[PDB]
Amino acid sequence: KRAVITGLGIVSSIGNNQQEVLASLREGRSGITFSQELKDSGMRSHVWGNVKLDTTGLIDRKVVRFMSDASIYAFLSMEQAIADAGLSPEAYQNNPRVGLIAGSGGGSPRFQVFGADAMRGPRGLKAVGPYVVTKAMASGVSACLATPFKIHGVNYSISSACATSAHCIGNAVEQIQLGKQDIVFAGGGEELCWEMACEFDAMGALSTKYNDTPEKASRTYDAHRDGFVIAGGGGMVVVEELEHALARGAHIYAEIVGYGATSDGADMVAPSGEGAVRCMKMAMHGVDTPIDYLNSHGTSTPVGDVKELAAIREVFGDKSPAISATKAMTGHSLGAAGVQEAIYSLLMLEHGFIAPSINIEELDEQAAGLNIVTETTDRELTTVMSNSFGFGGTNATLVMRKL
Amino acid sequence: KRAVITGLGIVSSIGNNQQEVLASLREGRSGITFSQELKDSGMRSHVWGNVKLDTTGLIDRKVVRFMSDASIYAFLSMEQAIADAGLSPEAYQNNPRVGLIAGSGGGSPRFQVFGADAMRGPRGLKAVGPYVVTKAMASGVSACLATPFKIHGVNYSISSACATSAHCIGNAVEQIQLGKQDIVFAGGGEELCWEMACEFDAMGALSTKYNDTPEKASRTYDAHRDGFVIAGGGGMVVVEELEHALARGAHIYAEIVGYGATSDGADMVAPSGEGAVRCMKMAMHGVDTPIDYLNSHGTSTPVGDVKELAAIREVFGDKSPAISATKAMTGHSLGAAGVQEAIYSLLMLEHGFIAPSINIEELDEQAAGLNIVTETTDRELTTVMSNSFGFGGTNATLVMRKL
Ligand SMILES: C=C/C(C)=C/[C@@]1(C)SC(=O)C(C)=C1O
Numbered sequence: 001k002r003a004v005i006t007g008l009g010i011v012s013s014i015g016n017n018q019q020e021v022l023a024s025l026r027e028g029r030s031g032i033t034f035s036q037e038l039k040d041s042g043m044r045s046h047v048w049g050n051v052k053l054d055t056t057g058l059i060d061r062k063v064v065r066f067m068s069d070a071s072i073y074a075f076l077s078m079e080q081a082i083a084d085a086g087l088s089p090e091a092y093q094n095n096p097r098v099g100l101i102a103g104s105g106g107g108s109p110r111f112q113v114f115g116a117d118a119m120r121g122p123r124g125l126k127a128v129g130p131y132v133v134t135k136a137m138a139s140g141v142s143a144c145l146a147t148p149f150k151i152h153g154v155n156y157s158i159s160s161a162c163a164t165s166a167h168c169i170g171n172a173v174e175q176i177q178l179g180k181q182d183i184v185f186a187g188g189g190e191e192l193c194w195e196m197a198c199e200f201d202a203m204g205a206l207s208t209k210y211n212d213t214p215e216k217a218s219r220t221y222d223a224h225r226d227g228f229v230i231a232g233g234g235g236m237v238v239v240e241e242l243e244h245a246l247a248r249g250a251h252i253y254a255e256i257v258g259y260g261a262t263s264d265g266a267d268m269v270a271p272s273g274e275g276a277v278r279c280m281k282m283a284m285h286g287v288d289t290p291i292d293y294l295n296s297h298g299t300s301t302p303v304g305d306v307k308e309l310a311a312i313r314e315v316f317g318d319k320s321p322a323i324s325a326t327k328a329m330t331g332h333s334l335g336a337a338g339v340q341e342a343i344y345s346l347l348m349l350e351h352g353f354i355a356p357s358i359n360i361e362e363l364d365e366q367a368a369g370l371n372i373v374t375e376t377t378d379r380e381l382t383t384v385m386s387n388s389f390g391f392g393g394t395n396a397t398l399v400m401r402k403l
Numbered sequence: 404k405r406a407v408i409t410g411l412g413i414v415s416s417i418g419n420n421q422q423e424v425l426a427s428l429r430e431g432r433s434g435i436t437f438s439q440e441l442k443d444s445g446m447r448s449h450v451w452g453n454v455k456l457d458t459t460g461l462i463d464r465k466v467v468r469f470m471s472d473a474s475i476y477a478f479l480s481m482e483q484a485i486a487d488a489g490l491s492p493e494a495y496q497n498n499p500r501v502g503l504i505a506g507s508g509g510g511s512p513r514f515q516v517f518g519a520d521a522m523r524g525p526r527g528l529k530a531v532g533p534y535v536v537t538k539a540m541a542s543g544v545s546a547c548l549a550t551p552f553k554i555h556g557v558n559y560s561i562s563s564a565c566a567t568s569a570h571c572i573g574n575a576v577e578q579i580q581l582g583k584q585d586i587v588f589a590g591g592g593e594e595l596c597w598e599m600a601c602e603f604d605a606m607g608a609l610s611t612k613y614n615d616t617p618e619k620a621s622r623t624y625d626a627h628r629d630g631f632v633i634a635g636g637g638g639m640v641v642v643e644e645l646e647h648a649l650a651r652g653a654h655i656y657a658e659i660v661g662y663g664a665t666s667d668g669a670d671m672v673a674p675s676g677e678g679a680v681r682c683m684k685m686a687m688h689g690v691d692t693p694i695d696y697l698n699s700h701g702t703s704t705p706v707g708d709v710k711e712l713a714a715i716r717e718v719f720g721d722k723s724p725a726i727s728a729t730k731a732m733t734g735h736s737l738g739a740a741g742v743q744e745a746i747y748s749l750l751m752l753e754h755g756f757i758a759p760s761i762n763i764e765e766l767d768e769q770a771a772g773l774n775i776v777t778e779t780t781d782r783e784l785t786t787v788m789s790n791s792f793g794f795g796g797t798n799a800t801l802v803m804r805k806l
Pocket residue numbers: 162205228264267268269270271272299301304305332389390391392393394
């Protein structure tokens with residue numbers, strides 16, 4: 001029935017491990033840089049939320065030859081989670097009660113585009129090769145991790161655009177609740193490339209006025225925000241059944257006491273708000289303790305930002321929780337955003353502090369009577385909430401509490 | 404607690420609705436044709452499992468601007484399932500207890516490539532446009548249906564390659580069991596294009612020796628099968644809680660009495676057998692009636708075919724059910740294969756007959772343990788099983804029974 005997080009792993013724009021990520025968060029350090037690749041592709045947005053790591057010989061050649069970047073990022077995060085959970089092969093491999101639910105928002109537009117380019121070349125099929133399917137397939141993140149880690153339980157991905165890894169964790173929780181699994185590795189990954197980024201720029205979703213000052217581009221709630229800053233990376237958490245965890249002396253960050261998954265059924269590319277309201281309310285249902293901190297989806301987009309503020313306010317009313325949008329620091333890793341931000345929230349719960357909402361030179365008047373924390377402040381948190389939304393009116397909310 | 408199917412919709416290579424599909428099945432009619440597109444693309448495989456329907460104007464212009472083919476196919480299938488189920492707008496729209504779980508195997512390689520191609524032109528972003536994200540993103544099938552159809556419940560896709568739509572239905576069942584939803588539209592869609600097909604051909608997965616005789620290319624269990632015949636299309640079923648279905652007098656096809664979801668944790672692109680055995684057995688927990696008919700995944704590939712037959716052998720021993728691989732007729736629609744074949748199984752349960760396993764000119768030596776019906780056989784069926792597997796060692800099994 002009860003699901004808890006007993007391990008985490010992360011490869012992000014602000015850190016290649018939970019320790020480095022902790023640093024950046026408490027420091028309020030930006031992971032955004034100028035991208036030549038993006039500028040070079042023809043894009044208007046030239047700022048990145050890139051992973052600063054040379055992944056070259058980190059994954060075995062036979063295993064890595066099937067993967068794309070989203071898979072690599074999630075695979076490395078999974079290793080970190082396996083290690084950090086205290087799990088050994090004999091404990092998680094070839095075991096029907098151990099599963100994997102992880103995905104990405106866009107799969108691999110790079111290798112999808114590589115296979116097409118290679119195919120139209122004079123060598124066609126031979127230029128494409130036998131590994132494009134596993135690299136480009138939408139289920140790449142799950143397929144590429146489940147096989148090498150010899151997972152025997154559930155094995156699939158959930159895709160809900162900018163909310164995918166959040167739904168992945170919520171689904172893992174349901175597997176434990178249904179008594180189907182004891183452990184489920186949940187999370188996701190996302191590649192960073194002009195191939196996919198250009199699509200978002202094409203719809204005017206990305207920031208384009210701060211290319212000269214990359215670290216100031218992502219400015220959630222700032223009156224002059226102009227779109228989100230795309231990013232790549234991965235994250236993975238170990239969702240485990242309470243008794244099982246306690247039984248093996250597992251270290252427990254918190255327990256997932258709430259999971260909301262709703263739908264807007266209104267517009268694509270634009271949030272309705274009511275959808276998020278029901279989602280958050282659903283995640284708080286039964287939680288007998290108040291929400292101390294709220295890690296908003298806050299993408300730094302004109303409409304989105306205030307639309308979520310309007311929702312939060314209607315759900316909490318007078319008594320609103322402390323809020324901070326860590327995207328102003330990290331950027332929007334799309335499909336990886338959900339798990340990565342759940343991890344930042346878990347780190348804040350574990351280290352008693354609230355990461356700051358940076359770059360707010362001018363608070364939006366639409367973000368009036370709320371509590372946007374712009375200073376790294378030490379606080380004994382107990383219950384935290386994380387929101388994730390994506391195109392198509394898909395919403396997810398996770399509420400985590402200490403034991 | 405209990406989940407039943409109260410409506411279905413389908414757009415496939417053998418039919419544009421349940422009536423045409425029924426006729427083709429009973430007749431063992433091939434939906435395979437020669438593809439100039441694939442031939443012109445430089446592929447060794449020139450046979451198609453195409454949808455014979457010009458979809459132009461079949462969807463509101465403002466609504467279809469966000470969709471790719473997989474989304475269109477699923478959207479049309481859902482239009483059918485809604486009407487079939489006898490659901491009125493007021494019954495399923497703007498309702499938190501009504502959800503949508505549908506996806507595809509590859510999303511939209513065509514629009515991932517179009518975005519990249521347009522980007523590298525003299526028009527760049529202007530040529531790309533603002534609708535490529537929703538078309539190219541992995542969650543397209545779910546995002547593009549949930550919004551127009553006014554869905555307020557769950558909204559996301561499950562992606563497990565050639566098993567995705569099967570896992571989608573299984574997940575919908577869990578939502579009903581967890582008491583979270585009363586109705587969940589489950590299924591998926593898949594586009595047909597050289598962009599995605601060349602990648603499979605590039606790994607030698609597609610049939611290439613029967614281009615001169617398209618209808619004989621897909622030959623599951625035939626000693627001379629040489630890969631699967633790619634296809635496109637959609638399918639959607641209405642998964643509904645039992646008391647709910649009966650309360651409104653919905654017409655129930657069958658109840659989902661079993662859902663297995665396992666993982667191989669062995670090889671990519673190649674099945675282990677073990678895993679599919681646990682998946683079937685898992686689907687069988689609680690089911691005490693015999694399996695009267697088994698709609699195998701049977702892709703018409705050398706290894707796959709006999710690896711699944713070995714697993715079926717292992718699960719049933721001396722008591723093996725009647726088997727038939729409808730892919731020899733329809734082709735492999737990848738992500739849509741699961742829901743489409745669940746529908747064929749539902750149609751056979753409904754009209755009392757077993758669709759034939761066509762093109763078996765020889766029958767692999769390993770298939771000696773017969774009961775693979777190669778002739779349309781009228782028979783009163785009660786419990787049927789459908790298998791779905793995909794790259795990455797992901798397995799799904801659904802068992803449906805008459806009420
Ligand atoms: C239905 C549309 C939604 C939820 C849109 C949001 C707020 S979610 C997101 O990640 C970005 C960039 C947005 O603009």
